Paper text:
[name] is an α-maltose 1-phosphate:(1→4)-α-d-glucan 4-α-d-maltosyltransferase (starch synthase (maltosyl-transferring), EC 2.4.99.16) and a member of the carbohydrate-active enzymes database (CAZy) GH13_3 family. It is the third and defining enzyme of the four-step [name] pathway that is responsible for the biosynthesis of a branched α-glucan. The key contribution that [name] makes is to preferentially extend A chains, limiting the opportunity for GlgB to introduce a second branch into B and C chains.
In an attempt to obtain a structure of a trapped maltosyl-enzyme intermediate with an acceptor bound in a productive conformation, we soaked a crystal of the [name] variant of [name] in both malto-octaose and 2-deoxy-2-fluoro-α-maltosyl fluoride. Fortuitously, this yielded a structure where malto-octaose was bound such that it occupied both the donor and cyclodextrin binding sites, whereas the donor analogue was unexpectedly absent from the crystal. This structure would therefore appear to represent a product-bound species with subsites −2 to +6 occupied. The two sugar residues in the donor site are oriented in a manner similar to those observed with maltose and α-maltose 1-phosphate. The product-bound structures of the [name] variant of [name] had an additional malto-oligosaccharide bound at a secondary site located on domain C. In each case, five glucose residues were well resolved, clearly showing that they that were wrapped around Tyr-646 of [name] [name].
Residue numbers in the entry:
A (entry chain A), B (entry chain B): 15 to 663
The structure:
Amino acid sequence: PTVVGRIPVLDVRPVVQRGRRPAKAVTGESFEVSATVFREGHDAVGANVVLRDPRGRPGPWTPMRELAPGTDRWGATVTAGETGTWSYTVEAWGDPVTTWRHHARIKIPAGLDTDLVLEEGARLYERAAADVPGREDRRELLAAVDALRDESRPAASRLAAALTPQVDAVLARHPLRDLVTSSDPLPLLVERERALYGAWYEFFPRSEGTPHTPHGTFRTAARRLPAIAAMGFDVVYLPPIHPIGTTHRKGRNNTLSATGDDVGVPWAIGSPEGGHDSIHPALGTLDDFDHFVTEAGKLGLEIALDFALQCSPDHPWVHKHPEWFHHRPDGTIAHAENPPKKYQDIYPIAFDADPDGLATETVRILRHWMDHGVRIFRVDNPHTKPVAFWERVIADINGTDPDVIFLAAAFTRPAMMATLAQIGFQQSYTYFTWRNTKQELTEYLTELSGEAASYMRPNFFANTPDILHAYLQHGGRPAFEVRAVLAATLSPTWGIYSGYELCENTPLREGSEEYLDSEKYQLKPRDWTRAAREGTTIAPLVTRLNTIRRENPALRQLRDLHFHPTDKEEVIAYSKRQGSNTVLVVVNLDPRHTQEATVSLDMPQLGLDWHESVPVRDELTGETYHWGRANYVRLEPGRTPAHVCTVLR
Amino acid sequence: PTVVGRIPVLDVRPVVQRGRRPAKAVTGESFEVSATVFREGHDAVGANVVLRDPRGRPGPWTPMRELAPGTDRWGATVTAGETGTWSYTVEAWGDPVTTWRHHARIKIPAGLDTDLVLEEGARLYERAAADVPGREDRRELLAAVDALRDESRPAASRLAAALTPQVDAVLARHPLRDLVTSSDPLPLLVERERALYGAWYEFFPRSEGTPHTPHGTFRTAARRLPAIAAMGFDVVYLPPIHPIGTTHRKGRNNTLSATGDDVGVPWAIGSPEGGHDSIHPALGTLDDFDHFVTEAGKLGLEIALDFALQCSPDHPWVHKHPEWFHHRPDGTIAHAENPPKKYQDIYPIAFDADPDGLATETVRILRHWMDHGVRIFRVDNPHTKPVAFWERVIADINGTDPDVIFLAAAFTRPAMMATLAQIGFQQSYTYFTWRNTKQELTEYLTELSGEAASYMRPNFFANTPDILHAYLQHGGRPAFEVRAVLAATLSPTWGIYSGYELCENTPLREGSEEYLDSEKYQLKPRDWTRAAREGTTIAPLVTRLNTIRRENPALRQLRDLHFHPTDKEEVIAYSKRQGSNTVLVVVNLDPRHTQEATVSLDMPQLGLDWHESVPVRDELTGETYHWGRANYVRLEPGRTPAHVCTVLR
Ligand SMILES: OC[C@H]1O[C@H](O[C@H]2[C@H](O)[C@@H](O)[C@@H](O[C@H]3[C@H](O)[C@@H](O)[C@@H](O[C@H]4[C@H](O)[C@@H](O)[C@@H](O[C@H]5[C@H](O)[C@@H](O)[C@@H](O[C@H]6[C@H](O)[C@@H](O)[C@@H](O[C@H]7[C@H](O)[C@@H](O)[C@@H](O[C@H]8[C@H](O)[C@@H](O)[C@@H](O)O[C@@H]8CO)O[C@@H]7CO)O[C@@H]6CO)O[C@@H]5CO)O[C@@H]4CO)O[C@@H]3CO)O[C@@H]2CO)[C@H](O)[C@@H](O)[C@@H]1O
Ligand SMILES: OC[C@H]1O[C@H](O[C@H]2[C@H](O)[C@@H](O)[C@@H](O[C@H]3[C@H](O)[C@@H](O)[C@@H](O[C@H]4[C@H](O)[C@@H](O)[C@@H](O[C@H]5[C@H](O)[C@@H](O)[C@@H](O[C@H]6[C@H](O)[C@@H](O)[C@@H](O[C@H]7[C@H](O)[C@@H](O)[C@@H](O[C@H]8[C@H](O)[C@@H](O)[C@@H](O)O[C@@H]8CO)O[C@@H]7CO)O[C@@H]6CO)O[C@@H]5CO)O[C@@H]4CO)O[C@@H]3CO)O[C@@H]2CO)[C@H](O)[C@@H](O)[C@@H]1O
Ligand SMILES: OC[C@H]1O[C@H](O[C@H]2[C@H](O)[C@@H](O)[C@@H](O[C@H]3[C@H](O)[C@@H](O)[C@@H](O[C@H]4[C@H](O)[C@@H](O)[C@@H](O[C@H]5[C@H](O)[C@@H](O)[C@@H](O)O[C@@H]5CO)O[C@@H]4CO)O[C@@H]3CO)O[C@@H]2CO)[C@H](O)[C@@H](O)[C@@H]1O
Ligand SMILES: OC[C@H]1O[C@H](O[C@H]2[C@H](O)[C@@H](O)[C@@H](O[C@H]3[C@H](O)[C@@H](O)[C@@H](O[C@H]4[C@H](O)[C@@H](O)[C@@H](O[C@H]5[C@H](O)[C@@H](O)[C@@H](O)O[C@@H]5CO)O[C@@H]4CO)O[C@@H]3CO)O[C@@H]2CO)[C@H](O)[C@@H](O)[C@@H]1O
């Protein structure tokens, strides 16, 4: 054998860990398959992509084209259908017909060996007619052959009866392919839509209580579901819903000692009342939780539970499974860390005494919540448990229930982030919150929509309970408006944590990214009705952004994204496309000062002529503009954070 | 079974075609094995490279280090030994001792759990002690244990007894590795020194004739070998030495019809007198060729024959193997093309009718010349024959005779260039002659000495019989000096085509890269004795450059190469190192004007202090300067084309 085939087809992308892990897509998503294709000598090559479904059935005729001249890099867009494990192949081939046309264009006019050239022609077109399975098509070609060999017609007459648009059509569909050479198949995992596209809202059920009973239940917190659905959200992420430990319970504002009333941190999971398969008694029963899930579902909301593989000192596991913890010479267990942060209320799990026991128990727990309608898990600190443990766990869960989605909350270095996504995590948190300037956003979104999109699906939370960026702190409401526009338009999945709507931005101290009086360590009742009444919420903008995403397919995908130059540091501009839907966004990143700029659009990228003018509608205002290659914009913080425009087609 | 191991070790490099083709090296050559290595949580990792020889014998302990902070990318240098197929593997592991130290360096001056910390170290050093081979080493580790355990001593002195330089050495040589995890082995092909390092000289034997017999023989051409070996060359590249066709034979200066005594083009191989297994009858007999080869060897020169797989119309193959050519509808064979260069004197070979017979015959022809001591083949136009043909042919020949070296004369696009080298070509012609400015040289050499060094070895011909670059046309002798120093010092393999010495630079016409009165179409007698008598030759400089190369191991390798800044655009600087040998080179690229500039060196990159001084010797002159951080140079065309300095230590 030989590594290289007759016509070289090499370095097929996408590829993840050299073929050992699947590339990713979701139902309905288009992406580029590419390859290096070329041949010996000067004759033309062609190439096509053969995408195959889980039962092995090939997709449609999908020809490729060289992506830039002289590079020998070929590409074509493919689209994924039903969920499951697909494969894709690039077929490369000599294209004698393009070759002969190239020569027949020059030699026939300038006079050289004409009878010979046309007869070389007729034999190609005759070989073309055999592989063609339709009879009306086949006759269209045998007409060109007889016209090529008809020596009573002059030279340019016999030539041009082979170069009609009528014949182009047949050969564009069934071309003559020499020396078909095939790459080895690469794997593609196609998952459900929600893996890539959705809006997420995080809240603490315990905060939504009553005057007589401050600690909310599932029954009381259900009253927020209608409002969350009215904002356009699809997923509700709940922090841990299990009993909370008492030993070393943290107090308000992350203090070491709890008072009597203090509720502790949901992440300090476990007490005598139960562990990860239990409900905090103050939240209600498993029955109340089913009713919450049922109400959520009737409003089009899925529930995502936090899975945090750690324990308070009171978790049953501490006595039932001591071997799942590292003990020091004196018997004690070191509390968890993530420096310079210390988690004095919890123990980390050790995996090397009993990995099998731990995988078995973990998938048992997940299967429990899956039985009760939870098909999404937000996995806490996955980067502090082994990578292979998650690879096993996710493989096991998806083996039986491929619809389950796991989101890696991996705020960590790039290698681990990438690796977690590559071993099966459906979505990932990202560096979004720490990308605020134009350069930062452009660089990073260029990275996420590029190569990374074959293994990572980003979830852009503009805030979290642990992340209030200095941009939001210093810039106030105009800043919240900017980051929501940015989050919802740059990623097909975005989210907020309750209170973002109210522009809560008081930090614990200057230089921190923690909230003052954080909800992690206390009940936090909010006057939602008063904020609506007095207009001190951005819930309308949030609602509007989700409607725009729901109405424009371009915003429900990731990979088609392009940045257009403006002439101000503070004004950034980008576009996204999907079929006939084009969305064009311009954002002022200055939350204190009005900016005016000229956005110089890159018209070929919008599928347009440079000299063209096209109507757009700002979906944030309903106002219509006429824009082309060079457009004045004026953006005033408070009043207009951005223009979010559809191209009227 | 998980793809990912316990301690992730990922994306091991070098790698060629995803592990389906070997990376390359030569005996004595050092290169970097790298990998992405990290683990879950905050604890430290270590890693090492296990290079295995062709019998499986592992190499020495070879620990890696993180190459830049926060990247998780680790590397170490390895050195290839005897020839054959080797393998390499990266081992990654938990480094508990480093982890304990970082925790203890903090927790002991604090006072936080000191008896408990020091017992944890004692127990680690106990484990470390068990795995050590040496008696003296195990005693040193068990001493540090008792010092850690001695509760009557203060905390800082118990710890200090485990942090000594004496213990550090033991553990760096024999460390305690948790959870050892291995990459899958990658293949390395190790070839003879000559594949990477050597000086090449091309000449046409027929031009070394007599007054009474103008057409040179192998007997007369042997008398040119001593001057070639005195110039310090290692290889003699001869154009095709076979009989030459008469049908469509070309005349002088590439005209279509030859006169009665025109000698034709050597590459138009074949007459009734023989094919690629025969000697041109004007060159002598097979026996004369053996005498020639022997005379070459006696002077330390190896012979490289041109292998051009093509035919004159009079080549026996035309009638014997008709299926080895492409025939038009009238039975005529179209002459070869490489547009706009027409080759009217030859036919190209077609490969898809009888590939087995073509391969069989090609290896037979190659084996014939190998029986007569030809161990190197300069393969003409490899990019016009199928890639898989050369893969097959090279695999065949190297399977019995691994010392045979194939050099790819592929002046073509990047993707084919690279692919040829990756499928087995030991050496590759390059874009060197079209890289004349500082920006061009730096960019290209950065490319050739980085990632492509794992599959391609460059041969820098400053000229060929097809390439007289304008730099040399417009530059005169000073330009010949510049390009010779550049070629000899930037690649461990370089060469020249005869006449380069004499500063032959008249082109066929303005804007061509062909020689006037090109030696391809005529006898080109050269009065070597006269040019030496008169000094109209750079043979002294050539001798000197090769001698410098023979005495500085830095110039006999490719991959260690760094460029240092200068403030003139016309002056380029670079260093190369190998063990304790370091060669600094500064070249004036201006052939017409005298140039002065400040060379600002990158002193860390030479293994030196920023505030350091170092004695250098320009080996071109014998002069000695004292250079440091910033250095004045004055380079005068004619007198001083460059400085080629060594570092005296
Ligand atoms: O009851 C228990 C418990 O409950 C709660 O706690 C829980 C939380 O509620 C829960 O959500 C969860 O949160 C924790 C989370 O899981 C942890 O991972 C942890 O994350 C935080 C980090 O600890 C913290 O440091 C920070 O980190 C982020 C940085 O601040 C950002 O700036 C950002 O940094 C990344 C860069 O953006 C990115 O570019 C890349 O950087 C690389 C560079 O590009 C590259 O050049 C190179 O840099 C070099 C330089 O070039 C060189 O010159 C020189 O300076 O070195 C550098 C590098 O050393 O390399 C760079 C890579 O290193 O990557 C950067 C990533 O490092 O992102 C950082 C990470 O996202 O914020 C994190 C998020 O908050 O802590 C979370 C909070 O606890 O789990 C908790 C436990 O269950 C309560 O809160 C508790 O009180 C309670 O006890
Ligand atoms: O008896 C028979 C016969 O005998 C003799 O002939 C024989 C000879 O004696 C023998 O030695 C042998 O020689 C021939 C050789 O084998 C042939 O291949 C042929 O080679 C010559 C070429 O025909 C000729 O064109 C030329 O080519 C070189 C260029 O001049 C250089 O400029 C250089 O170009 C390369 C670039 O340097 C490099 O960067 C790369 O460029 C790519 C870019 O990097 C990339 O960005 C992209 O560019 C885009 C741009 O982005 C875009 O904006 C826009 O501009 O488009 C471009 C792309 O179009 O892509 C670029 C390309 O992919 O590659 C460039 C080249 O591809 O290098 C060129 C090649 O090295 O010189 C060649 C060397 O001579 O001809 C030789 C001579 O015949 O075999 C002969 C046959 O046996 C006698 O001589 C005969 O008379 C006799 O009949
Ligand atoms: O298209 C979306 C846009 O629609 C509406 O804009 C209209 C404007 O309200 C209206 O005034 C008009 O725009 C005129 C503008 O009135 C006029 O003054 C002139 O603008 C000048 C600035 O006055 C001048 O300071 C300077 O400003 C920038 C410059 O743009 C920038 O390129 C760089 O050089 O810095 C300068 C200083 O910061 O130059 C500009 C012109 O380049 O010309 C404008 C041309 O139209 O008409 C607009 C509709 O066509 C909405 O009001 C607005 O909110 C929406 O964004
Ligand atoms: O190191 C290799 C070098 O060694 C020997 O050079 C020595 C000289 O022979 C010796 O005279 C001395 O050099 C003096 C120089 O004579 C003196 O004129 C001065 O040079 C000035 C220039 O006059 C001035 O035009 C300017 O030149 C450059 C500048 O360097 C550059 O950075 C940029 O700004 O462009 C300018 C315009 O061309 O500045 C320089 C000084 O920076 O000072 C020199 C100080 O050394 O010492 C030399 C070192 O030993 C050999 O003789 C010589 O052949 C070798 O090349």
